[PDB]
Amino acid sequence: SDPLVVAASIIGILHFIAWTIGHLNQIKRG
Amino acid sequence: SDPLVVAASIIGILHFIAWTIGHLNQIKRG
Amino acid sequence: SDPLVVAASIIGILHFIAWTIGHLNQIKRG
Amino acid sequence: SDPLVVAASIIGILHFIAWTIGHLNQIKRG
Ligand SMILES: C[C@@H](N)[C@]12C[C@H]3C[C@H](C[C@H](C3)C1)C2
């Protein structure tokens, strides 16, 4: 079922959760 | 089929805009 | 012509070139 | 003939590994 489309996407969402922790640079470092 | 293709890309604009605020750190440099 | 599939990846490569700037994150330490 | 869909998923694996590199920046700080 066109698993090719879901595979990339799946990683796409995986990056967001990682983003929040990375944002801490901004918050802290004004 | 459920819009799998657009569903993933939808988030993409989010990651793009969030990117800019990141660079904001290098400014002060320190 | 399923422009959705081709147009969405475009951003994908755009992030890689910007990525290298991040190296500056630790370049200044120790 | 241009597997765009699979083309993205192939790149991401590259991002995931470099991604952790940032974590040095924050952890040390907090
Ligand atoms: C880069 C990402 N938004 C995707 C990855 C794959 C190719 C394009 C459509 C869809 C699946 C999402 C672009």
Both structure tokens of B15 = 């990651």
The method recorded for this entry reads: NMR
Is the CB of residue A5 below 6 angstroms from any atom belonging to ligand 1?
yes
Selecting from B9, B19, B29 the residue whose C-beta is nearest the C-beta of C18 gives B19
Go through A1-30 and write b for each residue having 16 or more CB atoms within 10 A of its CB, e for each that does not: eeebbebbbebbeebeeeeeebeebeeeee
**Total number of domains constituting chain D:** 1
Between CA A15 and CA D20 the distance in angstroms is: 11
- CA dist., res. A15 & res. A28, Å (int): 21
Q: From CA D1, how far away is CA A21, in angstroms rounded?
A: 39
Distance of alpha carbon A14 from alpha carbon B12, whole angstroms: 12
Q: State the residue range of the domain holding C6.
A: 1-30
Choose, out of C1, C16, C24, the residue to mutate when testing the contact with D (most D CBs < 10 Å).
Answer: C16
